[PDB]
Amino acid sequence: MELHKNDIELKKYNIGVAISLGNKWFSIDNIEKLVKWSLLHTKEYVIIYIADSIKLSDSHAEEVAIRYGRNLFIKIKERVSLSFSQDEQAKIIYATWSDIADSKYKEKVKYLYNLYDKNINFKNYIENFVKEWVSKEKRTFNNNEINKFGRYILEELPALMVQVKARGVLFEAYVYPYKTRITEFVGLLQKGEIFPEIKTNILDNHPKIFLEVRE
């Protein structure tokens, strides 16, 4: 379980663990290993949050937090309190969607929402994103559901792109087991190589660092 870079063993960064809820790789055991890896390599804190989710709330991410995320976090906490010492447990921050989606963050989401409504090339590219995901599944989805899912990605996009605070604590880097179409998309966005208007408006030359960590 190692990094797939000298600043990492110089422990320059706090590390987030970006959990994909319902993704088969994110067993409790694989989460515990990412948390162990992060505690060893982090500057100080490890931030655990739900990074995506592929009506009790107008915000999809918030609905995921209240319906499933809490019970996920309860299981992670019990596992950690058996696997790690009290002083290591003190370094872990369980960041709900509310701890992340502060004022500044919601302005970034609203910029993306309005771009998704007023720019058809952006809507279409985000929608084509969803279609390739669910082309991999047996289940089928209409165009209205596809357009709904596209909005849901946008809610999580700033957290992948910009360095943000979880309950007062900046984390510059996050770990994820493999490159995805999303992490490739974010990489182009941060460079201004795709939809340059987004970098100009919502990003700021401290880019969120993606660390690929797996067995």
Residue numbers in the entry: 1 to 4, 11 to 60, 70 to 230
Authors' description from the paper:
Cyclodipeptide synthases (CDPSs) use aminoacylated tRNA (aa-tRNA) substrates to form peptide bonds between two amino acids yielding a cyclic dipeptide product (CDP). ParaCDPS from Parabacteroides sp. 20_3 (GenBank: EFK64745.1) produces cyclo(His-Phe)8 whilst ParcuCDPS from Parcubacteria bacterium RAAC4_OD1_1 (GenBank: ETB63777.1) can synthesise both cyclo(His-Glu) and cyclo(His-Pro)9. ParcuCDPS belongs to the XYP sub-group of the CDPS family, characterised by the presence of 3 residues: X40 where X is a non-conserved residue, Y202, and P203 (numbering respective to AlbC). ParcuCDPS displays a Rossman-fold common throughout the CDPS family.
Inspired by HisRS and histidine recognition more generally, and by the only high resolution structure of a CDPS with a ligand bound, we systematically altered three unique residues in ParcuCDPS P1, which we hypothesised to be participating in crucial interactions with the polar side chain of histidine. We first designed Generation 1 containing seven P1 mutants (Y55F; Y55V; E174A; E174H; E174L; Y189F and Y189L), and these variants were cloned, expressed in E.coli, purified and used for activity assays. From these calculations, P1 is predicted to be mostly neutral apart from Tyr55 and Glu174 which form a negatively charged microenvironment, while P2 is predicted to be mostly lined by positively charged residues. By mutating the P1 residues, the activity of the variants was vastly reduced with E174A and E174H incapable of tolerating histidine as a substrate. E174A removed the hydrogen bonding network thought to be essential for steering histidine into the pocket whilst E174H was designed to reverse the charge of the residue and was predicted to repel the incoming histidine from P1. Further investigation into the changes imposed by these mutants was performed by solving the crystal structures of a select few mutants containing changes to the active site or the pocket residues. The mutant structures were able to be solved using WT as a model and retained an equivalent fold to ParcuCDPS (Supplementary Notes 4 and 7 relating to Supplementary Figs. 13 and 14). Therefore, the disruption of activity is caused exclusively by the change in these few residues which appear important for the enzyme to produce a CDP.
